[PDB]
Amino acid sequence: MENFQKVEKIGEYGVVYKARNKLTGEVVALKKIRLPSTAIREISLLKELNHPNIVKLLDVIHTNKLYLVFEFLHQDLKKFMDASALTGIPLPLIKSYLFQLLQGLAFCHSHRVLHRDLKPQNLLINTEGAIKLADFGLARAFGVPVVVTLWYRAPEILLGCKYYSTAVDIWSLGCIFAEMVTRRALFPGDSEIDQLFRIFRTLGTPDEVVWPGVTSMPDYKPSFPKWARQDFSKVVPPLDEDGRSLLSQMLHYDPNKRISAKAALAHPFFQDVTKPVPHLRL
Numbered sequence: 001m002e003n004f005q006k007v008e009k010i011g012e013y014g015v016v017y018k019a020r021n022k023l024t025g026e027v028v029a030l031k032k033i034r035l036p037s038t039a040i041r042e043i044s045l046l047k048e049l050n051h052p053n054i055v056k057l058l059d060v061i062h063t064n065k066l067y068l069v070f071e072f073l074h075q076d077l078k079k080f081m082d083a084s085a086l087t088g089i090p091l092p093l094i095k096s097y098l099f100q101l102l103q104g105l106a107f108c109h110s111h112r113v114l115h116r117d118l119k120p121q122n123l124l125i126n127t128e129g130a131i132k133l134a135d136f137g138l139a140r141a142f143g144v145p146v147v148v149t150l151w152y153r154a155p156e157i158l159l160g161c162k163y164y165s166t167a168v169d170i171w172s173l174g175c176i177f178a179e180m181v182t183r184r185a186l187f188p189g190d191s192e193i194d195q196l197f198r199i200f201r202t203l204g205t206p207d208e209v210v211w212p213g214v215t216s217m218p219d220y221k222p223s224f225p226k227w228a229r230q231d232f233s234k235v236v237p238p239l240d241e242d243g244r245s246l247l248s249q250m251l252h253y254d255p256n257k258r259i260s261a262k263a264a265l266a267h268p269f270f271q272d273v274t275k276p277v278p279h280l281r282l
């Protein structure tokens with residue numbers, strides 16, 4: 001604030017505004033977070049850690065409040081999916097978007113940085129056909145003393161695992177992939193247990209056979225109902241076997257069997273990937 005002309009509120013960690021630097025004229029995304037050396041330092045390292053599929057962090061300012069200045073993009077995937085709901089996003093664009101998000105995840109995962117909260121609304125898109133990871137859920141992990149959507153949460157998170165791996169981002173991205181294809185949210189739960197049971201009713205209640213150690217998870221209960229796995233061809237029906245195969249590997253219960261971002265990039269689904277340009281109304 002005061003160094004910036006607030007153009008518009010663009011979302012609610014805190015509130016984010018489209019703002020214009022009063023001197024340079026740069027239009028940016030200003031994230032205001034209401035509230036440590038490691039936190040400030042570790043966040044500040046991200047300014048020089050850049051990738052084309054990751055939102056650029058331009059500046060960090062801390063005074064009771066933490067301000068993060070990001071590059072600005074006009075639209076996100078949630079808006080674009082709503083706009084495309086009658087026709088669906090064309091498969092070459094779905095494929096390009098999935099490819100780029102896996103590139104961004106492979107990058108930050110190779111730097112031991114997890115996103116933890118991937119959702120369509122956090123995925124920024126531009127007129128050039130790019131998509132970028134934004135709104136990283138990094139405050140808790142960096143140690144920042146700061147209704148939540150659970151639809152994209154990995155099952156190990158919902159079952160109380162305290163140590164997330166990179167696999168929780170692959171799960172979320174798998175859910176988003178399915179949603180681009182079918183134009184319906186895959187697992188739209190409204191409570192942690194409702195989220196978990198929606199997952200169980202589709203993929204089957206997990207057990208020690210498919211997920212060793214599942215019955216030892218902190219929030220696992222032997223009284224969980226035992227649902228059979230559904231025919232996976234019901235899940236994303238129109239999608240071809242290349243896409244379905246990739247999706248099933250992204251939705252493995254066992255985080256140790258869930259495909260990595262780098263390995264997913266080599267999957268045969270991406271052999272004909274291109275970079276179409278979307279039809280964006282701004």
Ligand SMILES: O=C(O)c1cc(C(F)(F)F)ccc1NCCc1c[nH]c2ccccc12
Nearest residue numbers: 043046049057108113134135136138139142
């Ligand atoms: O996205 C946010 O809101 C956000 C919030 C916080 C916190 F809440 F802790 F303050 C910290 C970082 C954030 N983004 C980083 C974006 C980024 C830039 N370069 C990267 C390289 C690898 C991985 C991520 C990045």
